[PDB]
Amino acid sequence: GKLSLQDVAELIRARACQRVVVMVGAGISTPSGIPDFRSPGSGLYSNLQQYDLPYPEAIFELPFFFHNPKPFFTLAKELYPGNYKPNVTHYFLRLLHDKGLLLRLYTQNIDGLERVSGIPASKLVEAHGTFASATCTVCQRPFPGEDIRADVMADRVPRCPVCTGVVKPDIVFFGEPLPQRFLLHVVDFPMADLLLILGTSLEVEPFASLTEAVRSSVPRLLINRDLVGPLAWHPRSRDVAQLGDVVHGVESLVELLGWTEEMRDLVQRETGKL
């Protein structure tokens, strides 16, 4: 009848599942120490309070951004490459890639930790964009993310050296389309033979609707604190919910797969390089 976590691990161990697509959100990166910009308590939260944000998500809305770009660049400074390391969840996905199982990893996060963990760019869809590149909001000139880093770290809003427009990192804001690579979902999701969903509430579209794009025979494993989204209201017969702390669900799956010592070796060697 209903599949267990051990069942999914055995499908992988028996090579019944070969082509895994992964969807992840902010829950996989809280163990790295990244503070939720919405939650009272952190220095990030306190620094955002000095501004006229009517509500936290205005940090990703263009009307607010053009009125006052400083809250967004306060978040950019916090999240810019180097301050945070990937954690066990990212390295599980990296080991999954190294073991030849990763068809594609779709992420909603903008912390860049998937690529830092060493997953190749070709295997990643950074569906909500990236700080790796930036674009002038007026003249549309592109820039390497490194080119605005000095300004961002000095608390200066980066300006375009040709037209003086605000230069905006290529983060997808509410109301904007997702990146071109998002369209890989048209060929990836029919090819997948297992879907993993980690650390997300599935509250943002069109990302969340991807859960419905796998074939009906394909198991969907959710590792998350709560049952969520299209899995809560359109349950399918091969769905599996591993409810609880994301890192502990990942550790349990890693042990069932037979990967624990290998994962610890990978994590030691990688976090050491950083």
């Binding site: 997702l178 069109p206 969340a208």
Partner: peptide
């Protein structure tokens, strides 16, 4: 690119 980025609520 399946729609614009949007909050489900």
């Amino acid at each position: 690119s399946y729609g614009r980025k949007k909050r489900r609520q």
